[PDB]
Symmetry: C2
Subunit: 340 residues, 2 copies
C-alpha cells in the first residue's frame, strides 16, 4: 500500500564553504597548557575524532546571512528567479532570534513575493531532511511549484567561548571531555530548490523515506549558541541501534538493499561514528563521501553540502540511487532516497 512521492524533483542545489580555516594543530597549541596540566596524552581531535580542520565565518555573519548566500547560489543553479518560490523553509540549528523565524529574515533579504509561505524547522542534525519532506508534501499536493530549503550554520561563538572555558586556571577535566565535542563543529551553508517534476523533467527525483525515533535519549546532546554538552560514547552506540531499526524500515518502504545503492550521503559526527556505521551495514566505504576531516560537523547542513559536492565534482550520473541518511539528537533517524 505505501506510495513514495512521484512528482517531486530537486531543481537546484548549492553550498557555501566558510572562508577562515582553524586547524586542529592551532587549537591544540592553544589548549596544550591545559592538556599538560592534566597530562592528556592523545590528540583527540586529529587522531581520534579525525578532524584536522574546520571553517569559520567572518565576525558577525549571522545564520540568516549564510543561508541567504546559499539560497542565491541555489536559485542560479536552478535557473529561476525568487518570484517562483512559494515556500521558504529554514532548517538550521543556528538561529538569529526566537522570533521572528530566521526563514522570514532570509525571505526578506531575497525579496520573496506575498504568496510565499515561510517558517523554520528545528530538529538538530536531521532538520534539512525534515524540511525536504515538508516541502515535498506541499509540492505533491499542488500548493506551490517551487520551494527553497535553506540552512546556515554559525559556530564562531561556540569556539570562542568553549576555548576560554577550556584554558581557564579553574578548569577541571570531567568538563573537558563533555565540552570537547564542540571543537568538532564547523561553519557552512547550503540550500536546495525543489520543484514539481513536470516543470523540470530532467532533474533528480526525491522519493521520500522513513523515520524512526528513540526519544528516551533526548538528554545526550544539549547545545545553545555558546555551549554544547554531549555524552559522546553513549550517543554513538544508541545511534547505531536506531539506524538498524531505520534500515529495516527502509527495506520495506523503499526497496533498499546496500549494493544496489550508488551513494550514501550521511551525516558525519566523526571518523569513528562513520566507520562503525559503514561496518555495521557492510556498506562499501567508497560510496560514502566525507568532508568532516576538513570541515567538521556542520549540523543539519552536512547532508546537503555533501550532496552538492557530489554533484559539482561530477560523481552523480543519471539513474544513480542516492541514500540520504542522518542520526540526529533526539534521537531521531531518517533515511530518504533521491534518484538522480
Amino acid at each position: 500500500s505505501h506510495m513514495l512521492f512521484q512528482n517531486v524533483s530537486i531543481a537546484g542545489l548549492a553550498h557555501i564553504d566558510a572562508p577562515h580555516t582553524l586547524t586542529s594543530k592551532e587549537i591544540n597549541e592553544r589548549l596544550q597548557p591545559t592538556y599538560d596540566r592534566l597530562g592528556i596524552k592523545t590528540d583527540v581531535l586529529g587522531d581520534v575524532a579525525g578532524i584536522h580542520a574546520r571553517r569559520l565565518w567572518d565576525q558577525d555573519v549571522q545564520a540568516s546571512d549564510a543561508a541567504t548566500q546559499a539560497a542565491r547560489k541555489a536559485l542560479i543553479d536552478a535557473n529561476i528567479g525568487i518570484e517562483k518560490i512559494g515556500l521558504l523553509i529554514n532548517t538550521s540549528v543556528s538561529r538569529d532570534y526566537l522570533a521572528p523565524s530566521t526563514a522570514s529574515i532570509v525571505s526578506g533579504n531575497l525579496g520573496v513575493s506575498d504568496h510565499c509561505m515561510t517558517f523554520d524547522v528545528a530538529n538538530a542534525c536531521l532538520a534539512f531532511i525534515n524540511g525536504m519532506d515538508i516541502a515535498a508534501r506541499m509540492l505533491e499536493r499542488g500548493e506551490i511549484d517551487y520551494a527553497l530549503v535553506v540552512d546556515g550554520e554559525t559556530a564562531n561563538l561556540v569556539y570562542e567561548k568553549t576555548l576560554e572555558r577550556m584554558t581557564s586556571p579553574d578548569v577541571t577535566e570531567e568538563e573537558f571531555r563533555n565540552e570537547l565535542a564542540a571543537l568538532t563543529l564547523g561553519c557552512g551553508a547550503a540550500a536546495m530548490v525543489m520543484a514539481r517534476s513536470e516543470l523540470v523533467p530532467d532533474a533528480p527525483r526525491y522519493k521520500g523515506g522513513v523515520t524512526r525515533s528513540a526519544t528516551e535519549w533526548n538528554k545526550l546532546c544539549r547545545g545553545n549558541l555558546d555551549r554544547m554538552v554531549t555524552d559522546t560514547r553513549l550517543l554513538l552506540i544508541e545511534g547505531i541501534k536506531l539506524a538498524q531499526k531505520t534500515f529495516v524500515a527502509a527495506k520495506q518502504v523503499l526497496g533498499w538493499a546496500v549494493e544496489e545503492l550508488d551513494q550514501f550521503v550521511i551525516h558525519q559526527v566523526s571518523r569513528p561514528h562513520t566507520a562503525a556505521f559503514v561496518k555495521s551495514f557492510g556498506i562499501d566505504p567508497a560510496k560514502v563521501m566525507t568532508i568532516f576531516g576538513e570541515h567538521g560537523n556542520i549540523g543539519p547542513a552536512s547532508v546537503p553540502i555533501v550532496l552538492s559536492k557530489l554533484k559539482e565534482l561530477g560523481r552523480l550520473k543519471k539513474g544513480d540511487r542516492i541514500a540520504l541518511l542522518g542520526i540526529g539528537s533526539g534521537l531521531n533517524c531518517s533515511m530518504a532516497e533521491v534518484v538522480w
Copy 2:
C-alpha cells in the same frame, strides 16, 4: 451543478482532542505599575499604558523552574485524555512554541521522551512566531490526509517568566531612555500558558470537528518589526498595527476565493491577540461582530502561538461551540505573516 475542485482544502482531517493549561501565578498590571511608577514619573507618563491603553489587567506566570517542554507535556497529557487515546497511537508530534529549552535537541523530542512515544513517532519543532500552531496543524493535516499516520499531536508551551524579570529590571533602571522603554513595553503584555491538540483521520473520529486548512500571505519586508529572545523582546507596535491590517486585507481576499468566506456567515472568530486597540481595529476593519470574538488578553495576555488553540479550548469548555459551527482561525504573526483557516465544529 458545476463540478469544482477542493481548492486544496484538507479532506478527512479532524480534531480529536484539545486542551489548555493556565499558568498558576497571577501578575497584575497594578503590581507592575507600582514597580514602574518612578520610571513613569521620570518619563512624564500619566496614563496607565497597560490596563487602559493595551487593555491588560493581569497575566499568568509559571514557577521559574518550568521549561517550555514541561508546560507542553502537561497540555499534551490532557489532550490525549480529551481524545481518549494512549500515546502509542501518535505517529507525529510537532512542537510549535516560540519558547524553547535549547537550540538542540528540539523541544519536540523532550516532550516526546516525557510522554513515551513509540519509535515510529516522527518529531520536530516548527518556529513561526505566533502562527506556528497553525503551520503545525497544516503539516500534520497533510500527513493525515495522505493516510501516513492516524493521529498527530501539536503542542505548545510558552514560558514568559524570564522576559518579565529582565524587562522589568531594564525598564526600572534610573538611566532607561524613553525610546528603550517604548521599544520593550510590549513584552509586558505577554503571558504564560500551554495548549495541545490531537488531530486524526476523520474515519477514526466521525463526530469530531473537521479542519479544512486555509490560506496564507506574507510581508517579509517587515521582518524587523518584532524581534525576540528568551530574555528580551523589542516591538514597533505602531507599524505592526498598520502593516498587519494591510496584510490581513490581502489575506481576506484570498480567504473569500479559497474558503468562500463572508464574515457574516462565520459563527466564531478565534483571533490571535496583541492588545485591545489592535483587536478593535481589526474587528472594525473587517466588519466582524464583536460578540463572535472571544478574548482572554485581559487576564492572560498574549500567549504567542498558543493563543489561538487556548481560545479554541476555552470556547469548547464554555459550551460556546456546537455541531456545524464555522470557526475562523485568524492571525498576524511577526514576519510578517497572516493565516486564516477554518474549522467546522
